[PDB]
Design a binder for these strands. Structure first.
Lengths: 5, 215, 153, 249
RNA sequence: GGUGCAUGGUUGUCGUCAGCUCGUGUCGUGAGAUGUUGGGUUAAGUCCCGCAACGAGCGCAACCCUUAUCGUUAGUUACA
RNA sequence: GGCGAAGGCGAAAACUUAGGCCAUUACUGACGCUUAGGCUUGAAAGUGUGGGGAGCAAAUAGGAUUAGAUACCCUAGUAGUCCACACCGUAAACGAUAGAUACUAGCUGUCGGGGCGAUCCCCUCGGUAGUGAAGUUAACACAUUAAGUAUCUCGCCUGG
RNA sequence: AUUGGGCGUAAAGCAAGCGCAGGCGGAUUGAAAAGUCUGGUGUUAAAGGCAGCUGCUUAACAGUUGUAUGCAUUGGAAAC
């Protein structure tokens, strides 16, 4: 998922 | 097999529909069989007026028929041509010595009265309209008016034989078991081309707390 | 998004003194460019069952790719002892399949494809086999990335 | 700089022979203890990843969630975290449908708030028995929905002390696309939980350590002082009843 | 006059028996199941604790009448 | 629980004899698997001959029950049930799962062999049970003793 | 069901064993080269099938040209 936003 | 929901609360939560008296059982029967004729004439001959109910008030050769109809003008007619006609049938069905002095008043938010909605259901069903969509449209339009739950069920020939295919519809709080409920009930005979269609409507019109007695 | 239905079934469970005839429906909906979803739901009457099935289908869609308007490599749809075969037809021939197969493929916005049912033919297993075959398909770019020969070889 | 290895005197060890085999990548070859010891370096990078994601989420202006169901200490623990950081939580049973569906629970929490404001405005004008019963369902609704009430949408992230006991919760989280972080014991299934933290949840001291560092890691993004996170020493050590006997009957 | 084996309406029985279902969700490829199940508690699916279920509806309950006690308004054609 | 390929094998002893298990630097040097046809074995019942015959008990008689009872119950009661020599070759002869080979998470047991070594425990090589992952399965379920991943061979099946 | 089926409970693993013939069968090196692969040659009648074309007022139809396939033999290859 890398990061949230 | 259950009791008519109208009668159980009638006379203790709902005022009577015809308040009058006469000489003891001499011609009280005559007055009742006469004013039911006026009631039937209103509910039968003029479908287009959507008469919710009629109030009959007799005391010793006087009569006043209060009416509550969604559309008063059809009873009135154009330049009062129909009011005189309808009142002369009322006279010829009541006699000649008794004053009549009818009154017609529009009923605020008529669509919360089960009578006119059942009449509309009868008109739609008799017109070969598919019953399910007519039920849904009528149900939505009634519920949107700001009332409580509804109960509409229909028996009879649903476009064919094997009548044991009856549809019922229930959409919220409508407590028969509660006497202090303020419930309305009606019934019409949608005379379809294949037989008789009985439409029944139950309307829940809010709580009737602190009523004490009939209005 | 055409949401074409395929088969309604008058299913029924038995209770003391009566039968709960509660007919259901299976529906296929597809954007015609890669979004595909199917909905099976049970309800007492047709339109509410249709609405429930459409909601269930459109709730859970998924994507698929386009290779000259068709699949590009062989695959067999294995699902619950019901196989369906998909073959990469040449561009011109067009869609040829049965009921549910044509529904699924056309709703996917495809074109030419070679199909043939194997084993059973109950529509839900048809749909399951077709989706499993269409999604287990690997893209040539994906296999190329996991290979050292990604340069068009 | 962050939670040196000196604190780890007993935070590795679980019931013997009750470990999922596929997660042995975190565990070194067995010793005679048979209580599965861990690798603390991987532990440290796992906590670092968890921290830099929860801080990012907190500065992303989202809502996170806390889960606790074991008998007393984790429940009181998450209660302390909630009273220390303004954020939702759960203390009683996971409702089995809390997240996969929310309309049927959003309406219930809205009814909760309506009854709360009804009590807040009413000067006992209702009957005494009526006030009693209304407070009664008020107590029930505070008991069950006490934690999840300051939110509008589904949480962007949630934690859990034990995915095994919260199989319902972790499964419902996995059904949706929201991530999840867990304190994964030796019996968990690593592929389900998004972010893995191999910590021992059987010992209450380890539990309080881990969730306090997580709470400060989110509170530092909430501008609050990180009491246990980035604290050098002489703050991590929390009171604890005698913590030993990792195997259980 | 016929067709209650075309019917509407009405009524009987199970039975004033505690039972019958629905919305969302989950499980199952599917009929379907989970609520309605487990513990105590009642006449009751009455209530509450446990519970992948959360709620809701009909019913049951209470709102009606009636007899059982006291206070008040009233006094006859009663009573005195 | 143990052994046997299967049917089966449990009061004691002797003789003959089978195959089995673990480590085998030893030897030989692909001599292996499957096996049409052929051969051997194969629960009970049954047949022939001679014995033996306590108990049990087909058939048969009687007493009850019933509407009837040529059955269920009871009292008798023959073949047989036992041994010696020949035959029959069927059984839900089942793990309803042909044999052989290699691989594929795990956990709990149990028994045999080796070593460490009072048993208790540790591990190794094997058999035998339970639980259970992926995987398979129409589902039930199977899952290192597969109904999984495959190969070789034999036998078998094509609606009732 | 060669491509293209199964044999626990749906039809289907013989009651089991010893096993001839047959089928299949460890690793390494060389040769030959039956299979196996490819090169040439010969041959595999016409009509018909396919495709183009021509001619029928156009298909129906008639005709033209090209088109596969297998086998024998011959040059090689030498993984199996």
């Amino acid at each position: 998922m890398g990061n949230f936003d | 097999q259950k009791v008519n929901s109208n009668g159980l609360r009638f006379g203790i939560n709902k005022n009577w529909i015809s308040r009058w008296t006469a000489n003891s059982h001499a011609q009280t029967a005559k007055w009742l069989i006469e004013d039911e004729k006026i009631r039937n004439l209103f509910f039968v001959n003029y479908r287009n007026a959507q008469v919710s109910n009629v109030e009959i008030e007799r005391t010793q050769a006087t009569v006043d028929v209060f009416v509550y109809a969604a559309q008063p003008a059809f009873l009135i007619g154009s330049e009062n041509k129909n009011i005189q006609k309808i009142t002369k049938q009322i006279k010829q069905i009541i006699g000649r010595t008794t004053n009549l002095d009818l009154t017609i008043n529009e009923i605020g938010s008529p669509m919360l009265s089960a009578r006119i909605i059942a009449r509309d259901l009868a008109n739609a069903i008799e017109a070969r309209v598919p019953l399910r969509t007519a039920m849904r449209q009528s149900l939505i339009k009634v519920l949107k008016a700001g009332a409580n739950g509804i109960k509409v069920l229909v028996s009879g020939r649903l476009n064919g034989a094997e009548i044991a295919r009856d549809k019922m519809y229930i959409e919220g709080n409508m407590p028969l078991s509660t006497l202090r409920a303020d419930i309305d009930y009606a019934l019409e005979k949608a005379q379809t081309t294949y037989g008789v269609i009985g439409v029944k409507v139950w309307i829940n019109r809010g709580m009737i707390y602190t009523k004490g007695l009939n209005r | 998004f055409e949401e074409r239905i395929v088969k309604l079934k008058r299913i029924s469970k038995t209770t003391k003194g009566g039968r709960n005839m509660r007919f259901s429906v299976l529906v296929v909906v597809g954007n015609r460019k890669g979004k595909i979803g199917y909905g099976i739901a049970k309800a007492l009457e047709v339109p509410n069952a249709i609405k429930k099935a459409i909601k269930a289908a459109h709730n859970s869609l998924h994507t698929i790719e386009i290779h000259k308007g068709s699949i590009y490599h062989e695959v067999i749809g294995r699902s619950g002892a019901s196989r369906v075969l998909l073959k990469p037809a040449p561009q011109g021939t067009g869609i040829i399949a049965g009921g549910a197969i044509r529904a699924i493929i056309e709703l996917a916005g495809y074109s030419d494809i070679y199909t043939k049912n194997l084993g059973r033919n109950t529509p839900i297993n048809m749909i399951h086999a077709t989706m499993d075959g269409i999604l287990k398909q690997l893209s040539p770019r994906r296999v190329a990335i996991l290979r050292n020969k990604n340069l068009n070889e | 700089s962050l939670a040196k290895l000196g604190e780890m005197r007993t935070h590795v060890g679980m019931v013997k022979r009750y470990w999922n085999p596929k997660m042995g990548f975190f565990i070194e070859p067995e010793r005679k203890h048979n209580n599965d010891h861990f690798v603390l370096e991987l532990q440290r990078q796992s906590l670092q990843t968890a921290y830099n994601y929860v801080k990012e989420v907190a500065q992303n202006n989202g809502q996170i969630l806390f889960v606790g169901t074991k008998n007393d200490y984790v429940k009181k623990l998450v209660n302390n975290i909630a009273k220390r950081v303004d954020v939702a939580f759960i203390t009683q049973r996971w409702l089995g449908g809390t997240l996969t569906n929310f309309k049927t629970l959003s309406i219930s929490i809205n009814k909760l708030n309506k009854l709360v404001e009804k009590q807040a405005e009413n000067a006992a004008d209702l009957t005494k028995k009526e006030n009693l019963m209304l407070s009664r369902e008020i107590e029930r609704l505070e008991k069950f929905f006490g934690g999840v009430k300051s939110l509008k949408r589904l949480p962007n992230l949630l934690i859990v002390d034990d995915p095994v006991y919260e199989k319902n919760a972790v499964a419902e989280a996995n059904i949706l696309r929201i991530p999840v972080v867990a304190l994964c014991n030796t019996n968990t299934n690593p592929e389900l939980v998004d972010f893995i933290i191999p910590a021992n949840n059987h010992q209450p001291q380890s539990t309080c350590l881990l969730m306090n560092l997580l709470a400060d890691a989110v509170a530092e993004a909430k501008a609050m002082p990180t009491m246990f996170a980035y604290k050098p020493d002489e703050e991590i050590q929390i009171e604890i009843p005698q913590k030993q006997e990792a195997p259980r009957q």
